[PDB]
Short mmCIF file of C-alpha atoms in Angstrom, two decimals:
data_model
loop_
_atom_site.label_atom_id
_atom_site.label_comp_id
_atom_site.label_asym_id
_atom_site.label_seq_id
_atom_site.Cartn_x
_atom_site.Cartn_y
_atom_site.Cartn_z
CA UNK A 4 16.94 -5.91 -24.24
CA UNK A 5 14.39 -7.08 -24.24
CA UNK A 6 12.62 -8.83 -21.38
CA UNK A 7 9.04 -10.11 -21.35
CA UNK A 8 8.13 -7.36 -18.90
CA UNK A 9 9.37 -4.64 -21.23
CA UNK A 10 7.61 -6.14 -24.25
CA UNK A 11 4.52 -6.21 -22.06
CA UNK A 12 4.93 -2.52 -21.16
CA UNK A 13 5.48 -1.53 -24.80
CA UNK A 14 2.58 -3.64 -26.04
CA UNK A 15 -1.21 -3.48 -25.81
CA UNK A 16 -2.21 -1.51 -22.68
CA UNK A 17 -5.10 -3.86 -21.83
CA UNK A 18 -2.94 -7.00 -21.82
CA UNK A 19 -0.33 -5.10 -19.81
CA UNK A 20 -2.85 -4.02 -17.16
CA UNK A 21 -4.10 -7.61 -16.80
CA UNK A 22 -0.74 -9.39 -16.75
CA UNK A 23 0.82 -6.97 -14.25
CA UNK A 24 -2.08 -6.44 -11.82
CA UNK A 25 -2.85 -10.15 -11.35
CA UNK A 26 0.59 -11.13 -9.96
CA UNK A 27 0.36 -8.03 -7.75
CA UNK A 28 -3.09 -9.00 -6.44
CA UNK A 29 -1.74 -12.46 -5.67
CA UNK A 30 1.33 -11.11 -3.90
CA UNK A 31 -0.73 -8.62 -1.90
CA UNK A 32 -3.24 -11.34 -1.03
CA UNK A 33 -0.51 -13.42 0.60
CA UNK A 34 0.65 -10.39 2.60
CA UNK A 35 -2.90 -9.91 3.85
CA UNK A 36 -3.02 -13.62 4.73
CA UNK A 37 0.16 -13.28 6.80
CA UNK A 38 -1.40 -10.32 8.62
CA UNK A 39 -4.59 -12.19 9.48
CA UNK A 40 -2.70 -15.29 10.61
CA UNK A 41 -0.39 -13.19 12.80
CA UNK A 42 -3.35 -11.49 14.45
CA UNK A 43 -4.58 -14.89 15.56
CA UNK A 44 -1.22 -15.95 17.02
CA UNK A 45 -0.85 -12.67 18.91
CA UNK A 46 -4.43 -12.53 20.22
CA UNK A 47 -3.77 -15.82 22.02
CA UNK A 48 -0.90 -14.23 23.95
CA UNK A 49 -3.09 -12.08 26.19
CA UNK A 50 -4.00 -8.39 26.79
CA UNK A 51 -0.55 -6.97 27.59
CA UNK A 52 1.36 -8.54 24.70
CA UNK A 53 -1.43 -7.72 22.24
CA UNK A 54 -1.15 -4.04 23.16
CA UNK A 55 2.61 -4.01 22.64
CA UNK A 56 1.97 -4.44 18.94
CA UNK A 57 -0.61 -1.65 19.06
CA UNK A 58 2.11 0.62 20.42
CA UNK A 59 4.65 -0.01 17.65
CA UNK A 60 2.14 -0.22 14.81
CA UNK A 61 2.18 3.53 13.97
CA UNK A 62 5.99 3.52 13.77
CA UNK A 63 6.00 0.29 11.75
CA UNK A 64 3.43 1.74 9.35
CA UNK A 65 5.61 4.84 9.16
CA UNK A 66 8.53 2.76 7.94
CA UNK A 67 6.29 1.00 5.41
CA UNK A 68 4.92 4.35 4.22
CA UNK A 69 8.43 5.62 3.51
CA UNK A 70 9.75 2.38 2.03
CA UNK A 71 6.74 1.88 -0.23
CA UNK A 72 6.79 5.54 -1.26
CA UNK A 73 10.37 5.22 -2.48
CA UNK A 74 9.23 1.99 -4.14
CA UNK A 75 6.47 3.58 -6.22
CA UNK A 76 8.60 6.61 -7.12
CA UNK A 77 11.24 4.19 -8.37
CA UNK A 78 8.69 2.17 -10.33
CA UNK A 79 7.15 5.25 -11.95
CA UNK A 80 10.50 6.81 -12.90
CA UNK A 81 11.78 3.57 -14.43
CA UNK A 82 8.59 2.82 -16.39
CA UNK A 83 8.71 6.29 -17.95
CA UNK A 84 12.38 5.91 -18.93
CA UNK A 85 11.69 2.54 -20.54
CA UNK A 86 8.71 3.97 -22.42
CA UNK A 87 10.96 6.73 -23.73
CA UNK A 88 13.56 4.09 -24.65
CA UNK A 89 16.01 5.88 -22.35
CA UNK A 90 18.01 2.82 -21.31
CA UNK A 91 20.81 4.85 -19.72
CA UNK A 92 18.14 6.77 -17.85
CA UNK A 93 16.33 3.67 -16.60
CA UNK A 94 19.61 2.08 -15.47
CA UNK A 95 20.59 5.28 -13.67
CA UNK A 96 17.24 5.58 -11.88
CA UNK A 97 17.61 1.99 -10.69
CA UNK A 98 21.02 2.57 -9.11
CA UNK A 99 19.91 5.96 -7.71
CA UNK A 100 16.98 4.15 -6.05
CA UNK A 101 19.16 1.50 -4.42
CA UNK A 102 21.51 4.11 -2.96
CA UNK A 103 18.48 6.04 -1.72
CA UNK A 104 17.25 2.81 -0.13
CA UNK A 105 20.49 2.60 1.87
CA UNK A 106 20.29 6.28 2.81
CA UNK A 107 16.64 6.18 3.89
CA UNK A 108 16.66 2.77 5.57
CA UNK A 109 19.75 3.35 7.71
CA UNK A 110 18.66 6.91 8.56
CA UNK A 111 15.37 5.52 9.89
CA UNK A 112 17.28 3.10 12.12
CA UNK A 113 19.73 5.64 13.59
CA UNK A 114 17.02 8.25 14.21
CA UNK A 115 14.42 6.01 15.88
CA UNK A 116 16.75 3.82 17.97
CA UNK A 117 17.69 6.52 20.52
CA UNK A 118 14.18 7.97 20.32
CA UNK A 119 12.11 4.82 20.78
CA UNK A 120 12.32 4.61 24.60
CA UNK A 121 11.05 8.15 25.22
CA UNK A 122 8.34 7.84 22.55
CA UNK A 123 6.51 4.95 24.22
CA UNK A 124 6.82 6.56 27.65
CA UNK A 125 5.50 9.95 26.56
CA UNK A 126 2.72 8.20 24.66
CA UNK A 127 1.46 7.61 28.19
CA UNK A 128 1.89 4.01 29.34
CA UNK A 131 4.68 -3.80 30.97
CA UNK A 132 3.23 -3.69 27.44
CA UNK A 133 5.81 -0.96 26.89
CA UNK A 134 8.92 -3.08 27.46
CA UNK A 135 7.71 -5.57 24.84
CA UNK A 136 6.86 -2.84 22.34
CA UNK A 137 10.37 -1.47 22.84
CA UNK A 138 11.89 -4.89 22.16
CA UNK A 139 9.47 -5.31 19.25
CA UNK A 140 10.48 -1.91 17.87
CA UNK A 141 14.18 -2.65 18.37
CA UNK A 142 14.11 -5.80 16.23
CA UNK A 143 12.20 -4.25 13.33
CA UNK A 144 14.12 -0.95 13.35
CA UNK A 145 17.25 -3.08 12.99
CA UNK A 146 15.78 -4.23 9.68
CA UNK A 147 14.57 -0.87 8.37
CA UNK A 148 17.14 -0.89 5.54
CA UNK A 149 16.02 -4.41 4.61
CA UNK A 150 12.41 -3.19 4.42
CA UNK A 151 13.28 -0.21 2.22
CA UNK A 152 15.60 -2.23 -0.01
CA UNK A 153 12.89 -4.87 -0.53
CA UNK A 154 10.31 -2.25 -1.53
CA UNK A 155 12.84 -0.64 -3.89
CA UNK A 156 13.71 -3.94 -5.54
CA UNK A 157 9.99 -4.57 -5.93
CA UNK A 158 9.58 -1.13 -7.47
CA UNK A 159 12.43 -1.78 -9.90
CA UNK A 160 10.90 -5.09 -11.02
CA UNK A 161 7.49 -3.42 -11.43
CA UNK A 162 9.02 -0.52 -13.35
CA UNK A 163 10.40 -2.87 -16.01
CA UNK A 164 7.19 -4.88 -16.16
CA UNK A 165 8.41 -7.85 -14.12
CA UNK A 166 5.36 -8.35 -11.91
CA UNK A 167 6.14 -12.07 -11.76
CA UNK A 168 9.34 -11.74 -9.71
CA UNK A 169 7.82 -8.87 -7.75
CA UNK A 170 4.97 -11.20 -6.80
CA UNK A 171 7.43 -14.01 -6.07
CA UNK A 172 9.40 -11.83 -3.64
CA UNK A 173 6.20 -10.83 -1.83
CA UNK A 174 5.04 -14.46 -1.70
CA UNK A 175 8.40 -15.81 -0.52
CA UNK A 176 8.58 -13.14 2.16
CA UNK A 177 5.05 -13.34 3.52
CA UNK A 178 5.00 -17.12 3.09
CA UNK A 179 8.14 -17.66 5.17
CA UNK A 180 6.83 -15.23 7.78
CA UNK A 181 3.66 -17.33 7.98
CA UNK A 182 5.81 -20.43 8.56
CA UNK A 183 8.14 -18.76 11.07
CA UNK A 184 5.34 -17.18 13.13
CA UNK A 185 4.07 -20.14 15.18
CA UNK A 186 7.56 -21.63 15.47
CA UNK A 187 9.06 -18.42 16.89
CA UNK A 188 6.13 -17.37 19.09
CA UNK A 189 5.02 -20.66 20.65
CA UNK A 190 7.39 -23.49 19.73
CA UNK A 191 10.53 -21.58 20.74
CA UNK A 192 8.65 -19.61 23.41
CA UNK A 193 9.81 -16.14 22.34
CA UNK A 194 6.29 -14.75 22.70
CA UNK A 195 5.23 -11.56 20.92
CA UNK A 196 8.83 -10.55 20.14
CA UNK A 197 9.06 -13.89 18.34
CA UNK A 198 6.78 -12.38 15.70
CA UNK A 199 9.24 -9.54 15.14
CA UNK A 200 12.17 -11.91 14.65
CA UNK A 201 10.07 -14.02 12.29
CA UNK A 202 9.38 -10.89 10.26
CA UNK A 203 13.02 -9.72 10.32
CA UNK A 204 14.36 -13.09 9.16
CA UNK A 205 11.69 -13.30 6.45
CA UNK A 206 12.60 -9.84 5.18
CA UNK A 207 16.24 -10.93 5.08
CA UNK A 208 15.54 -14.04 2.99
CA UNK A 209 13.51 -11.83 0.65
CA UNK A 210 16.53 -9.52 0.32
CA UNK A 211 18.78 -12.46 -0.54
CA UNK A 212 16.53 -13.38 -3.46
CA UNK A 213 16.26 -9.78 -4.69
CA UNK A 214 20.00 -9.17 -4.37
CA UNK A 215 20.60 -12.47 -6.19
CA UNK A 216 18.48 -11.33 -9.14
CA UNK A 217 19.85 -7.78 -9.20
CA UNK A 218 23.53 -8.29 -8.40
CA UNK A 219 24.39 -11.93 -9.16
CA UNK A 220 22.26 -13.15 -12.05
CA UNK A 221 21.88 -9.58 -13.35
CA UNK A 222 19.04 -10.70 -15.62
CA UNK A 223 16.82 -7.68 -15.06
CA UNK A 224 16.27 -5.36 -18.02
CA UNK A 225 18.09 -2.56 -16.20
CA UNK A 226 21.86 -2.64 -15.71
CA UNK A 227 22.82 -1.94 -12.11
CA UNK A 228 26.45 -0.83 -11.83
CA UNK A 229 28.42 2.02 -10.27
CA UNK A 230 29.99 2.62 -13.69
CA UNK A 231 26.58 3.46 -15.16
CA UNK A 232 25.89 5.75 -12.20
CA UNK A 233 25.92 9.54 -12.61
CA UNK A 234 24.59 11.66 -9.70
CA UNK A 235 21.45 13.41 -10.94
CA UNK A 236 19.41 16.20 -9.37
CA UNK A 237 16.61 15.46 -11.85
CA UNK A 238 16.41 11.73 -11.11
CA UNK A 239 16.36 12.48 -7.38
CA UNK A 240 13.62 15.08 -7.87
CA UNK A 241 11.70 12.67 -10.12
CA UNK A 242 11.65 9.87 -7.54
CA UNK A 243 10.80 12.22 -4.67
CA UNK A 244 8.02 13.99 -6.58
CA UNK A 245 6.16 10.67 -6.47
CA UNK A 246 7.79 9.02 -3.47
CA UNK A 247 7.38 11.73 -0.83
CA UNK A 248 3.72 12.56 -1.61
CA UNK A 249 3.07 8.80 -1.65
CA UNK A 250 4.31 8.48 1.95
CA UNK A 251 2.37 11.57 3.03
CA UNK A 252 -0.79 9.94 1.67
CA UNK A 253 -0.49 7.09 4.17
CA UNK A 254 -0.03 9.74 6.86
CA UNK A 255 -3.33 11.24 5.71
CA UNK A 256 -5.00 7.83 6.01
CA UNK A 257 -3.66 7.31 9.53
CA UNK A 258 -4.81 10.76 10.61
CA UNK A 259 -8.20 10.16 9.01
CA UNK A 260 -8.28 6.82 10.82
CA UNK A 261 -7.64 8.65 14.09
CA UNK A 262 -10.51 11.05 13.38
CA UNK A 263 -12.81 8.23 12.24
CA UNK A 264 -12.10 6.30 15.44
CA UNK A 265 -13.02 9.40 17.44
CA UNK A 266 -16.35 9.96 15.69
CA UNK A 267 -17.09 6.27 16.22
CA UNK A 268 -16.88 6.47 20.03
CA UNK A 269 -19.16 9.48 19.98
CA UNK A 270 -21.67 7.46 17.92
CA UNK A 271 -20.97 5.07 19.38
CA UNK A 272 -19.12 3.98 22.48
CA UNK A 273 -16.26 1.51 23.04
CA UNK A 274 -18.36 -1.13 21.33
CA UNK A 275 -19.04 1.33 18.52
CA UNK A 276 -15.29 1.60 18.00
CA UNK A 277 -15.02 -2.19 17.91
CA UNK A 278 -17.78 -2.44 15.29
CA UNK A 279 -16.15 0.18 13.06
CA UNK A 280 -12.76 -1.52 13.44
CA UNK A 281 -14.18 -4.92 12.47
CA UNK A 282 -16.20 -3.53 9.56
CA UNK A 283 -13.31 -1.41 8.26
CA UNK A 284 -10.91 -4.36 8.41
CA UNK A 285 -13.33 -6.57 6.45
CA UNK A 286 -14.08 -3.86 3.87
CA UNK A 287 -10.35 -3.25 3.33
CA UNK A 288 -10.00 -6.82 2.06
CA UNK A 289 -11.69 -5.66 -1.14
CA UNK A 290 -9.14 -2.85 -1.35
CA UNK A 291 -6.47 -5.43 -2.23
CA UNK A 292 -7.51 -5.96 -5.87
CA UNK A 293 -7.65 -2.18 -6.32
CA UNK A 294 -4.11 -1.72 -4.99
CA UNK A 295 -3.01 -4.48 -7.37
CA UNK A 296 -4.59 -2.64 -10.28
CA UNK A 297 -3.10 0.66 -9.11
CA UNK A 298 0.44 -0.72 -9.17
CA UNK A 299 -0.08 -1.95 -12.74
CA UNK A 300 -1.74 1.33 -13.75
CA UNK A 301 1.30 3.32 -12.59
CA UNK A 302 3.62 1.11 -14.65
CA UNK A 303 1.54 1.00 -17.83
CA UNK A 304 0.56 4.69 -17.86
CA UNK A 305 4.19 5.48 -17.04
CA UNK A 306 5.54 3.60 -20.04
CA UNK A 307 2.77 5.09 -22.18
CA UNK A 308 3.72 8.56 -20.95
CA UNK A 309 7.31 7.86 -21.97
CA UNK A 310 6.18 6.87 -25.46
CA UNK A 311 4.15 10.09 -25.63
CA UNK A 312 1.14 7.92 -26.41
CA UNK A 313 -1.80 9.51 -24.60
CA UNK A 314 -4.35 7.19 -26.20
CA UNK A 315 -2.47 4.22 -24.75
CA UNK A 316 -2.27 5.94 -21.35
CA UNK A 317 -5.97 6.84 -21.31
CA UNK A 318 -6.87 3.32 -22.42
CA UNK A 319 -4.92 1.59 -19.64
CA UNK A 320 -6.22 4.02 -17.02
CA UNK A 321 -9.86 3.53 -18.08
CA UNK A 322 -9.52 -0.23 -18.57
CA UNK A 323 -8.09 -0.55 -15.07
CA UNK A 324 -11.12 1.33 -13.75
CA UNK A 325 -13.48 -1.03 -15.60
CA UNK A 326 -11.86 -4.25 -14.34
CA UNK A 327 -11.60 -3.00 -10.74
CA UNK A 328 -15.21 -1.78 -10.89
CA UNK A 329 -16.50 -5.21 -11.90
CA UNK A 330 -14.32 -6.99 -9.33
CA UNK A 331 -15.73 -4.77 -6.58
CA UNK A 332 -19.34 -5.46 -7.63
CA UNK A 333 -18.70 -9.13 -6.88
CA UNK A 334 -16.93 -8.24 -3.63
CA UNK A 335 -19.67 -5.87 -2.46
CA UNK A 336 -22.52 -8.21 -3.40
CA UNK A 337 -20.76 -11.09 -1.63
CA UNK A 338 -20.27 -9.05 1.55
CA UNK A 339 -23.84 -7.71 1.69
CA UNK A 340 -25.35 -11.11 0.88
CA UNK A 341 -23.23 -13.04 3.38
CA UNK A 342 -23.11 -10.29 6.03
CA UNK A 343 -24.44 -12.46 8.89
CA UNK A 344 -22.04 -15.30 8.03
CA UNK A 345 -19.06 -12.94 7.77
CA UNK A 346 -19.89 -11.07 10.98
CA UNK A 347 -20.17 -14.46 12.72
CA UNK A 348 -16.61 -15.32 11.69
CA UNK A 349 -15.10 -12.06 12.94
CA UNK A 350 -17.03 -12.01 16.22
CA UNK A 355 -18.42 -10.52 21.99
CA UNK A 356 -21.68 -11.47 20.26
CA UNK A 357 -23.77 -8.44 21.22
CA UNK A 358 -22.06 -6.33 18.56
CA UNK A 359 -22.82 -8.86 15.82
CA UNK A 360 -26.08 -7.16 14.87
CA UNK A 361 -24.27 -3.83 14.68
CA UNK A 362 -21.57 -5.41 12.51
CA UNK A 363 -24.06 -6.97 10.09
CA UNK A 364 -25.66 -3.56 9.56
CA UNK A 365 -22.19 -2.12 8.95
CA UNK A 366 -21.27 -4.79 6.38
CA UNK A 367 -24.53 -3.92 4.64
CA UNK A 368 -23.70 -0.22 4.57
CA UNK A 369 -19.94 0.42 4.77
CA UNK A 370 -18.47 -1.47 1.78
CA UNK A 371 -20.79 0.23 -0.74
CA UNK A 372 -18.11 2.82 -1.52
CA UNK A 373 -15.80 0.08 -2.82
CA UNK A 374 -17.78 0.32 -6.06
CA UNK A 375 -16.71 3.92 -6.70
CA UNK A 376 -13.22 3.57 -5.19
CA UNK A 377 -11.53 2.48 -8.47
CA UNK A 378 -12.58 5.74 -10.16
CA UNK A 379 -10.45 7.83 -7.81
CA UNK A 380 -7.53 5.54 -7.03
CA UNK A 381 -6.74 4.66 -10.64
CA UNK A 382 -6.62 8.41 -11.14
CA UNK A 383 -4.10 8.68 -8.31
CA UNK A 384 -2.27 5.69 -9.77
CA UNK A 385 -1.90 7.31 -13.18
CA UNK A 386 -1.05 10.67 -11.58
CA UNK A 387 1.91 8.77 -10.13
CA UNK A 388 2.62 7.15 -13.50
CA UNK A 389 2.99 10.55 -15.14
CA UNK A 390 5.16 11.67 -12.24
CA UNK A 391 2.72 14.10 -10.62
CA UNK A 392 2.44 12.58 -7.14
CA UNK A 393 1.43 15.86 -5.49
CA UNK A 394 -1.90 15.57 -7.32
CA UNK A 395 -2.27 12.07 -5.88
CA UNK A 396 -1.59 13.42 -2.39
CA UNK A 397 -4.06 16.28 -2.84
CA UNK A 398 -6.75 13.85 -3.98
CA UNK A 399 -6.01 11.52 -1.06
CA UNK A 400 -6.18 14.39 1.44
CA UNK A 401 -9.48 15.50 -0.12
CA UNK A 402 -10.84 11.96 0.10
CA UNK A 403 -9.63 10.71 3.50
CA UNK A 404 -9.66 13.91 5.57
CA UNK A 405 -12.10 16.43 4.07
CA UNK A 406 -14.76 14.05 2.72
CA UNK A 407 -14.63 10.88 4.87
CA UNK A 408 -14.32 12.61 8.23
CA UNK A 409 -16.43 15.65 7.40
CA UNK A 410 -19.45 13.69 6.21
CA UNK A 411 -19.09 11.16 9.03
CA UNK A 412 -19.00 13.97 11.59
CA UNK A 413 -21.96 15.69 9.92
CA UNK A 414 -24.14 12.57 9.74
CA UNK A 415 -23.29 11.82 13.38
CA UNK A 416 -23.45 15.17 15.17
CA UNK A 417 -26.21 16.84 13.15
CA UNK A 418 -28.41 13.75 13.07
CA UNK A 419 -29.93 11.17 15.42
CA UNK A 420 -28.34 8.29 13.50
CA UNK A 421 -25.74 6.30 15.43
CA UNK A 422 -23.03 4.07 13.98
CA UNK A 423 -25.15 4.07 10.82
CA UNK A 424 -24.32 7.76 10.49
CA UNK A 425 -20.65 6.84 10.32
CA UNK A 426 -20.97 4.31 7.49
CA UNK A 427 -23.28 6.59 5.53
CA UNK A 428 -20.97 9.58 5.98
CA UNK A 429 -17.92 7.54 4.97
CA UNK A 430 -19.69 6.05 1.93
CA UNK A 431 -21.02 9.39 0.66
CA UNK A 432 -17.69 11.15 1.22
CA UNK A 433 -15.74 8.42 -0.57
CA UNK A 434 -18.19 8.54 -3.48
CA UNK A 435 -18.07 12.33 -3.84
CA UNK A 436 -14.27 12.17 -3.73
CA UNK A 437 -14.26 9.57 -6.50
CA UNK A 438 -16.44 11.69 -8.79
CA UNK A 439 -14.16 14.69 -8.27
CA UNK A 440 -10.96 12.71 -8.76
CA UNK A 441 -12.19 10.92 -11.87
CA UNK A 442 -13.16 14.30 -13.31
CA UNK A 443 -9.73 15.67 -12.38
CA UNK A 444 -8.26 12.66 -14.16
CA UNK A 445 -10.29 13.46 -17.27
CA UNK A 446 -9.18 17.11 -17.31
CA UNK A 447 -5.55 16.09 -16.87
CA UNK A 448 -5.74 13.63 -19.77
CA UNK A 449 -7.50 16.19 -21.96
CA UNK A 450 -4.69 18.58 -21.01
CA UNK A 451 -2.13 15.97 -22.06
CA UNK A 452 -3.86 15.63 -25.44
CA UNK A 453 -3.33 19.31 -26.19
CA UNK A 454 0.33 19.23 -25.18
#
C-alpha cells in the first residue's frame, strides 16, 4: 500500500496497457526463443528421439493449459479486488490461488503417473520409452509448473509485470543455457531436455517463493491468518480459469482438424507446409498475447472501480496498439516471404511455403479485435464468453471455411490459408461486436 503496479492499475488506462504489456511481450518472446532453440537441439538427435517429444506434447500442453488457466483466473480476480479497493479480498484470492496450485499440480502428477504407460501404448506405437521417461520427469514437476503460473498471475493481478517478466526470463533463459549442456555435453539425450526444463522451473519457483514468502514485498499479503475459505472466490477463479483451459483444448482440436484438411489438400508435404507457415505466423501472436494479459489486468481493475469509460478505453487502446504492431508484422512477413521460407526450409516445398506466408498471416491484422475482447471478458470475470468466442473462432469458423474452400473448390493448400483467414476475420468482427454490446450493457448497469 501502495506499489508501483497498483498505482499503475489505478491510473491512466493507456499508460497501464503500455507498461504492463511490454514486459509481458518481452517475457513471452524469451519463452518463444527457448522453444525455437530447443527444436534445433532435438532435431539433431534423430527421428526416434524427435518423435518422443511429439508423443508427450499433447499432455505437456494439457498441463500448461490448466496451469495458465488458473494463472489468468487468479490475475483477473486479484485485479478486480484491487480496483474495488478490497484489500482483504485481494489477499484472500492470492492465498486461495496458491492452495489451488498445490491441489491442481499434485493431482495432475498422481493421476497421470499410473496412466502414462498405457496412454502411449494405446496411442498406437522405441520412441515410446523415451516419451515415457520424458513424461515422467515433467509430470514430477507439474506442481512447480502450476505454482509458477499462479505466482505470475498474482504479480500480473497487482500490476507487477516487471517481476512477472523477470520470472519468465529467468526460467526460459536458464532452460536455454541448460539445454545443450544436458542433451549433448552430459549425454542425456532427449530426456536431458526434460531435466533442463524441470530444473529451470525449480529455480523460477525459488525466485517466486522468495518474493512471495520471504521478502513479502508484493502488494498482497499472503498468510494463513488472512485466509478464509470462500465458495465465491473459488467460483470466481474457476469461472475464468476453467474456460481458459478449455479454450486451449479447442485450439488443439482445431489444430487436429486443420492438419487433417491439410493432408487432403494437400498431402504429407501439404501438412509440412501448413505446419511451417502456422509456426511462423504464430510468432506475431506473441505481441497480442502480451497485450491480452495487460488488458485483463487493466479492465479488471477498471471493473472493480466501476469505471466503464476506463475499461472501454483500455480495451480499445489495446486493440489499436496490437493492430498497428500486426501491420508491421504482416507487411514484414509478406515482403520477406522468400527469405523467411528459406530460413525455415526439403526445398521443394519452399514455393508452397512462400505462397502460404503471403496468404496465411493476413488474419493477424484482425486478430486483436477478437482476442482483446476475450481478454476483457476475462477481466470482467466472464470467461465462458471468452470460451464461446474461442470455440466459434477456432472450430466453427477456421475449420469450416478451410474445409469449404478445400472440398467445394479446386484450390489446394491455398484453399486452406484462405479459409483460415476468412474464418478468423469473420470471428473477429463478431467478437468485437459482442464486446461492444457487452460494454454498452455495462454502461446501463
